């Protein structure tokens, strides 16, 4: 059994689909948790020390990783799953490439390659798993594109907790606003009014601080929760990547349809 560590939950779901019962999977950053602020527990160094393969996002998403690799003394092969992805410059590259379904296909192919490197005998099983999961991703990508196409182009703007959806925007044509640092909420609400934003969404990885505040001051409904950088727990509505994207796509579409 191939010993695999995935840095966070979204990647961990891809690994489970490619590897099936051939791998033993450990995921560092869990559901409803923020990788941007993650600090590795000493248990994580043990996980890395025992792994054959480490699956990471790259693009500086996991700031803790290079330290953990040296502290753990691991000799694991480290796969950067955004290898080969058309990345986007950040307002440094924007790490949230999984929000566009064609990029998730590339993640999945890089995982199969990483497993093939470490376990040649299983390569055909891994590639069969990947090709099957990639079929479901292509259909998911078609559903999302069509549902956003079925919306009038004048209401396509939603508000979110952080700038995590720029690849979704680029792929699908929904624009996202989010607060930043400081306290320029007045500037946000102005832009909310300028762009006629339909809805404010919470995020599963963040406290619903301001987002309730902004929704009141903007006079908009808090329409629900979007899953940005982490899956939900197993009995939440985003327990795997495909469920997460259909939840997000349906929640956004419902909010954009209510004028
Ligand atoms: Zn993020």
Residue numbers in the entry: 26 to 116, 134 to 225, 234 to 309
Sentences from the paper on this structure:
In addition to dimeric membrane permease and cytosolic ATPase proteins, bacterial ABC transporters rely on periplasmic (Gram-negative) or cell surface (Gram-positive) solute binding proteins (SBP). The SBP is essential to bind the substrate with high affinity and specificity and deliver it to the membrane permease for transport into the cell. SBPs have been categorized according to structure and substrate specificity, with members of group A-I mediating transport of zinc, manganese, or iron. Secondly, AztC (residues 222–229) referred to as the Z-loop must be displaced away from the zinc binding site in order for the complex to form.
